[PDB]
Amino acid sequence: KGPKVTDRVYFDMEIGGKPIGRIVIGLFGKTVPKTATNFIELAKKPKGEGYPGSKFHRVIADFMIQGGDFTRGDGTGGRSIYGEKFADENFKLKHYGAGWLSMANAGADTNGSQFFITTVKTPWLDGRHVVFGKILEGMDVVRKIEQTEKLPGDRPKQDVIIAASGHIAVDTPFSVEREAVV
């Protein structure tokens, strides 16, 4: 009964130049096609133009990890394939638990490139941030990032970099449970 994964995206992660493993995300291309498409294309862009080379600039343990600011690296930048900003596509899905993918924003209809991966269930974000994927593999890599040493301002002391990213196609869309990722 769960939403269908139609596409995969991978992130090969490094912290301060040390490889820490791959995150694999399933995207709900039937539920939020426009949001999913943005993410997939930004994952396919080259550095400075998309996710490769960008960092998780905001990390809050017992909450979420946030990245996708490929133009300013600090939360103030980023842009979508549709222009600087695009509208909230729908709020069909909730932040069911750790390991859900949702768009960062600065209020209604301000989606860019920035996104976060939850590390706990975050009901207060439901209806405010568009949820569009679920972690499929590499939740331990997420947790590694979640626990990385921080500076004040919720910033990793060492850069947490998406060294590489890309899109793996999907056979046959499959349903996933609306539950925390183990």
PDB file of C-alpha atoms in Angstrom:
ATOM      1  CA  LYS A   1       0.000   0.000   0.000  1.00  0.00           C
ATOM      2  CA  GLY A   2       3.109   2.157   0.341  1.00  0.00           C
ATOM      3  CA  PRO A   3       4.200   4.736  -2.204  1.00  0.00           C
ATOM      4  CA  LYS A   4       6.135   3.340  -5.170  1.00  0.00           C
ATOM      5  CA  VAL A   5       9.854   3.728  -5.746  1.00  0.00           C
ATOM      6  CA  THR A   6      10.327   4.520  -9.451  1.00  0.00           C
ATOM      7  CA  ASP A   7      13.963   5.675  -9.451  1.00  0.00           C
ATOM      8  CA  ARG A   8      17.151   5.391  -7.419  1.00  0.00           C
ATOM      9  CA  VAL A   9      19.772   7.979  -6.657  1.00  0.00           C
ATOM     10  CA  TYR A  10      23.171   7.271  -5.066  1.00  0.00           C
ATOM     11  CA  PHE A  11      25.493   9.530  -3.080  1.00  0.00           C
ATOM     12  CA  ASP A  12      29.088   8.396  -2.447  1.00  0.00           C
ATOM     13  CA  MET A  13      29.897  10.191   0.772  1.00  0.00           C
ATOM     14  CA  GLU A  14      33.158  11.433   2.259  1.00  0.00           C
ATOM     15  CA  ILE A  15      33.920  13.275   5.485  1.00  0.00           C
ATOM     16  CA  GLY A  16      37.064  15.440   5.403  1.00  0.00           C
ATOM     17  CA  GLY A  17      38.282  13.403   2.395  1.00  0.00           C
ATOM     18  CA  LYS A  18      37.703  10.028   4.009  1.00  0.00           C
ATOM     19  CA  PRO A  19      35.215   7.769   2.211  1.00  0.00           C
ATOM     20  CA  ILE A  20      32.372   6.596   4.419  1.00  0.00           C
ATOM     21  CA  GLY A  21      30.121   4.617   2.053  1.00  0.00           C
ATOM     22  CA  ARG A  22      27.194   4.985  -0.302  1.00  0.00           C
ATOM     23  CA  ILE A  23      23.687   6.216   0.378  1.00  0.00           C
ATOM     24  CA  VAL A  24      20.988   4.842  -1.967  1.00  0.00           C
ATOM     25  CA  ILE A  25      17.674   6.701  -2.104  1.00  0.00           C
ATOM     26  CA  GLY A  26      14.382   5.547  -3.652  1.00  0.00           C
ATOM     27  CA  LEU A  27      12.307   8.391  -5.230  1.00  0.00           C
ATOM     28  CA  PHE A  28       8.478   8.450  -5.396  1.00  0.00           C
ATOM     29  CA  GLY A  29       8.188   9.389  -9.047  1.00  0.00           C
ATOM     30  CA  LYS A  30       4.463   8.517  -9.226  1.00  0.00           C
ATOM     31  CA  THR A  31       3.614  10.467  -6.072  1.00  0.00           C
ATOM     32  CA  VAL A  32       5.732  13.592  -6.606  1.00  0.00           C
ATOM     33  CA  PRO A  33       7.015  13.406 -10.171  1.00  0.00           C
ATOM     34  CA  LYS A  34       8.049  17.038 -10.416  1.00  0.00           C
ATOM     35  CA  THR A  35       9.968  17.050  -7.132  1.00  0.00           C
ATOM     36  CA  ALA A  36      11.493  13.663  -7.841  1.00  0.00           C
ATOM     37  CA  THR A  37      12.605  14.801 -11.296  1.00  0.00           C
ATOM     38  CA  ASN A  38      14.340  17.876  -9.903  1.00  0.00           C
ATOM     39  CA  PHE A  39      16.304  15.750  -7.442  1.00  0.00           C
ATOM     40  CA  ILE A  40      17.266  13.114 -10.017  1.00  0.00           C
ATOM     41  CA  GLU A  41      18.481  15.698 -12.523  1.00  0.00           C
ATOM     42  CA  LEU A  42      20.507  17.613  -9.897  1.00  0.00           C
ATOM     43  CA  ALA A  43      22.086  14.297  -8.937  1.00  0.00           C
ATOM     44  CA  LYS A  44      23.151  13.863 -12.572  1.00  0.00           C
ATOM     45  CA  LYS A  45      24.680  17.333 -12.984  1.00  0.00           C
ATOM     46  CA  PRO A  46      28.437  17.915 -12.709  1.00  0.00           C
ATOM     47  CA  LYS A  47      30.007  19.673  -9.758  1.00  0.00           C
ATOM     48  CA  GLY A  48      29.053  23.311  -9.200  1.00  0.00           C
ATOM     49  CA  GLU A  49      25.924  22.619 -11.228  1.00  0.00           C
ATOM     50  CA  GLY A  50      24.374  19.955  -9.015  1.00  0.00           C
ATOM     51  CA  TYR A  51      24.900  17.634  -6.048  1.00  0.00           C
ATOM     52  CA  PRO A  52      28.450  16.281  -6.797  1.00  0.00           C
ATOM     53  CA  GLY A  53      30.898  18.261  -4.698  1.00  0.00           C
ATOM     54  CA  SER A  54      28.228  19.827  -2.504  1.00  0.00           C
ATOM     55  CA  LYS A  55      28.084  19.223   1.235  1.00  0.00           C
ATOM     56  CA  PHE A  56      25.716  18.433   4.084  1.00  0.00           C
ATOM     57  CA  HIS A  57      26.090  21.870   5.583  1.00  0.00           C
ATOM     58  CA  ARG A  58      23.580  21.437   8.402  1.00  0.00           C
ATOM     59  CA  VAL A  59      23.626  18.359  10.617  1.00  0.00           C
ATOM     60  CA  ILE A  60      21.512  17.973  13.727  1.00  0.00           C
ATOM     61  CA  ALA A  61      21.753  14.680  15.611  1.00  0.00           C
ATOM     62  CA  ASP A  62      18.359  13.236  16.576  1.00  0.00           C
ATOM     63  CA  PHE A  63      16.762  15.327  13.834  1.00  0.00           C
ATOM     64  CA  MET A  64      18.050  15.349  10.303  1.00  0.00           C
ATOM     65  CA  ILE A  65      20.943  15.957   7.924  1.00  0.00           C
ATOM     66  CA  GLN A  66      20.570  18.681   5.292  1.00  0.00           C
ATOM     67  CA  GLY A  67      22.379  19.406   2.063  1.00  0.00           C
ATOM     68  CA  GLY A  68      21.918  20.315  -1.578  1.00  0.00           C
ATOM     69  CA  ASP A  69      23.162  23.941  -1.353  1.00  0.00           C
ATOM     70  CA  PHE A  70      25.471  23.691  -4.368  1.00  0.00           C
ATOM     71  CA  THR A  71      25.751  27.446  -4.902  1.00  0.00           C
ATOM     72  CA  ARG A  72      26.507  28.832  -1.439  1.00  0.00           C
ATOM     73  CA  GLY A  73      27.213  25.734   0.631  1.00  0.00           C
ATOM     74  CA  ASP A  74      25.603  27.277   3.665  1.00  0.00           C
ATOM     75  CA  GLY A  75      21.872  27.061   3.363  1.00  0.00           C
ATOM     76  CA  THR A  76      21.295  30.340   1.536  1.00  0.00           C
ATOM     77  CA  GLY A  77      21.842  29.102  -1.995  1.00  0.00           C
ATOM     78  CA  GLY A  78      20.696  26.374  -4.324  1.00  0.00           C
ATOM     79  CA  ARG A  79      18.259  26.331  -7.202  1.00  0.00           C
ATOM     80  CA  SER A  80      16.030  23.929  -9.059  1.00  0.00           C
ATOM     81  CA  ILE A  81      15.973  22.803 -12.670  1.00  0.00           C
ATOM     82  CA  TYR A  82      12.744  24.845 -13.021  1.00  0.00           C
ATOM     83  CA  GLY A  83      14.215  28.180 -12.011  1.00  0.00           C
ATOM     84  CA  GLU A  84      15.315  29.495  -8.637  1.00  0.00           C
ATOM     85  CA  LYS A  85      12.220  28.196  -6.792  1.00  0.00           C
ATOM     86  CA  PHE A  86       9.242  25.957  -7.468  1.00  0.00           C
ATOM     87  CA  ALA A  87       5.915  25.321  -5.781  1.00  0.00           C
ATOM     88  CA  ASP A  88       5.091  22.711  -3.160  1.00  0.00           C
ATOM     89  CA  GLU A  89       3.934  19.876  -5.371  1.00  0.00           C
ATOM     90  CA  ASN A  90       1.689  18.061  -2.846  1.00  0.00           C
ATOM     91  CA  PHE A  91       1.847  16.885   0.781  1.00  0.00           C
ATOM     92  CA  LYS A  92       0.676  13.367   0.104  1.00  0.00           C
ATOM     93  CA  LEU A  93       3.517  11.851   2.177  1.00  0.00           C
ATOM     94  CA  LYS A  94       4.595  12.401   5.797  1.00  0.00           C
ATOM     95  CA  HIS A  95       7.985  12.231   7.555  1.00  0.00           C
ATOM     96  CA  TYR A  96       7.205   8.713   8.755  1.00  0.00           C
ATOM     97  CA  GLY A  97      10.467   8.106  10.639  1.00  0.00           C
ATOM     98  CA  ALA A  98      14.248   8.109  10.136  1.00  0.00           C
ATOM     99  CA  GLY A  99      15.386   7.856   6.550  1.00  0.00           C
ATOM    100  CA  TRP A 100      12.827   9.933   4.692  1.00  0.00           C
ATOM    101  CA  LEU A 101      13.777  12.496   2.082  1.00  0.00           C
ATOM    102  CA  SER A 102      12.117  15.894   2.013  1.00  0.00           C
ATOM    103  CA  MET A 103      12.626  19.312   0.515  1.00  0.00           C
ATOM    104  CA  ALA A 104      14.158  22.037   2.635  1.00  0.00           C
ATOM    105  CA  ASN A 105      12.458  25.401   2.188  1.00  0.00           C
ATOM    106  CA  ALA A 106      11.979  28.895   3.485  1.00  0.00           C
ATOM    107  CA  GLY A 107       8.174  28.754   3.659  1.00  0.00           C
ATOM    108  CA  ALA A 108       5.415  27.945   1.130  1.00  0.00           C
ATOM    109  CA  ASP A 109       6.473  27.283  -2.427  1.00  0.00           C
ATOM    110  CA  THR A 110      10.182  27.867  -2.046  1.00  0.00           C
ATOM    111  CA  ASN A 111      11.688  24.526  -3.115  1.00  0.00           C
ATOM    112  CA  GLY A 112      15.170  24.786  -4.615  1.00  0.00           C
ATOM    113  CA  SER A 113      17.835  22.115  -4.537  1.00  0.00           C
ATOM    114  CA  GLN A 114      18.202  21.773  -0.782  1.00  0.00           C
ATOM    115  CA  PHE A 115      16.877  18.652   0.886  1.00  0.00           C
ATOM    116  CA  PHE A 116      17.106  16.752   4.113  1.00  0.00           C
ATOM    117  CA  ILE A 117      17.149  13.188   5.263  1.00  0.00           C
ATOM    118  CA  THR A 118      15.351  12.677   8.548  1.00  0.00           C
ATOM    119  CA  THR A 119      17.061  10.723  11.328  1.00  0.00           C
ATOM    120  CA  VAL A 120      13.967  10.517  13.538  1.00  0.00           C
ATOM    121  CA  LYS A 121      10.210  10.820  12.886  1.00  0.00           C
ATOM    122  CA  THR A 122       9.432  14.525  12.423  1.00  0.00           C
ATOM    123  CA  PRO A 123       5.659  15.079  12.501  1.00  0.00           C
ATOM    124  CA  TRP A 124       5.941  18.827  13.007  1.00  0.00           C
ATOM    125  CA  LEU A 125       7.300  19.050   9.437  1.00  0.00           C
ATOM    126  CA  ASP A 126       4.328  17.233   7.878  1.00  0.00           C
ATOM    127  CA  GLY A 127       2.390  19.404   5.437  1.00  0.00           C
ATOM    128  CA  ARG A 128       5.198  21.989   5.390  1.00  0.00           C
ATOM    129  CA  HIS A 129       7.992  20.115   3.569  1.00  0.00           C
ATOM    130  CA  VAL A 130       7.390  17.947   0.497  1.00  0.00           C
ATOM    131  CA  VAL A 131       8.454  14.347   1.165  1.00  0.00           C
ATOM    132  CA  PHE A 132       9.685  12.587  -1.958  1.00  0.00           C
ATOM    133  CA  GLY A 133      11.980   9.616  -1.183  1.00  0.00           C
ATOM    134  CA  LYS A 134      13.130   6.995   1.320  1.00  0.00           C
ATOM    135  CA  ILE A 135      16.600   5.681   2.131  1.00  0.00           C
ATOM    136  CA  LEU A 136      16.998   2.141   0.654  1.00  0.00           C
ATOM    137  CA  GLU A 137      20.641   1.413   1.501  1.00  0.00           C
ATOM    138  CA  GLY A 138      23.295   3.142   3.560  1.00  0.00           C
ATOM    139  CA  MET A 139      21.273   4.263   6.537  1.00  0.00           C
ATOM    140  CA  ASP A 140      24.436   3.517   8.498  1.00  0.00           C
ATOM    141  CA  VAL A 141      26.167   6.112   6.301  1.00  0.00           C
ATOM    142  CA  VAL A 142      23.438   8.604   7.230  1.00  0.00           C
ATOM    143  CA  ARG A 143      24.035   7.839  10.909  1.00  0.00           C
ATOM    144  CA  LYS A 144      27.762   8.335  10.469  1.00  0.00           C
ATOM    145  CA  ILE A 145      27.018  11.835   9.155  1.00  0.00           C
ATOM    146  CA  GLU A 146      24.469  12.429  11.877  1.00  0.00           C
ATOM    147  CA  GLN A 147      27.123  11.773  14.531  1.00  0.00           C
ATOM    148  CA  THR A 148      30.034  13.627  12.910  1.00  0.00           C
ATOM    149  CA  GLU A 149      31.839  16.230  15.017  1.00  0.00           C
ATOM    150  CA  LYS A 150      30.118  19.634  14.799  1.00  0.00           C
ATOM    151  CA  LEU A 151      30.894  23.342  15.055  1.00  0.00           C
ATOM    152  CA  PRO A 152      28.375  25.777  16.552  1.00  0.00           C
ATOM    153  CA  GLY A 153      25.648  26.536  14.031  1.00  0.00           C
ATOM    154  CA  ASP A 154      24.997  22.831  13.425  1.00  0.00           C
ATOM    155  CA  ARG A 155      27.850  22.661  10.859  1.00  0.00           C
ATOM    156  CA  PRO A 156      30.076  19.534  10.451  1.00  0.00           C
ATOM    157  CA  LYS A 157      33.629  20.383  11.536  1.00  0.00           C
ATOM    158  CA  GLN A 158      34.930  18.462   8.554  1.00  0.00           C
ATOM    159  CA  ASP A 159      33.182  18.838   5.194  1.00  0.00           C
ATOM    160  CA  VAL A 160      30.662  16.068   4.541  1.00  0.00           C
ATOM    161  CA  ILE A 161      30.829  15.849   0.778  1.00  0.00           C
ATOM    162  CA  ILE A 162      28.797  14.090  -1.843  1.00  0.00           C
ATOM    163  CA  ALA A 163      31.916  13.019  -3.713  1.00  0.00           C
ATOM    164  CA  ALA A 164      29.811  11.426  -6.434  1.00  0.00           C
ATOM    165  CA  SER A 165      26.153  11.062  -7.297  1.00  0.00           C
ATOM    166  CA  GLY A 166      23.988   9.596 -10.007  1.00  0.00           C
ATOM    167  CA  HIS A 167      20.720   7.946 -10.966  1.00  0.00           C
ATOM    168  CA  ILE A 168      20.126   4.175 -11.100  1.00  0.00           C
ATOM    169  CA  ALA A 169      17.038   3.302 -13.134  1.00  0.00           C
ATOM    170  CA  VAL A 170      14.305   1.111 -11.671  1.00  0.00           C
ATOM    171  CA  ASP A 171      13.134  -2.137 -13.247  1.00  0.00           C
ATOM    172  CA  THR A 172       9.646  -2.101 -11.952  1.00  0.00           C
ATOM    173  CA  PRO A 173       8.378   0.384  -9.356  1.00  0.00           C
ATOM    174  CA  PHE A 174       7.974  -1.199  -5.936  1.00  0.00           C
ATOM    175  CA  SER A 175       5.970  -0.176  -2.881  1.00  0.00           C
ATOM    176  CA  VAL A 176       7.780   0.610   0.387  1.00  0.00           C
ATOM    177  CA  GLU A 177       6.285   0.762   3.893  1.00  0.00           C
ATOM    178  CA  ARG A 178       5.476   4.137   5.485  1.00  0.00           C
ATOM    179  CA  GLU A 179       7.882   3.404   8.323  1.00  0.00           C
ATOM    180  CA  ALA A 180      11.262   4.428   9.693  1.00  0.00           C
ATOM    181  CA  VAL A 181      14.285   3.111   7.827  1.00  0.00           C
ATOM    182  CA  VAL A 182      16.190   0.541   9.854  1.00  0.00           C
TER     183      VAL A 182
END
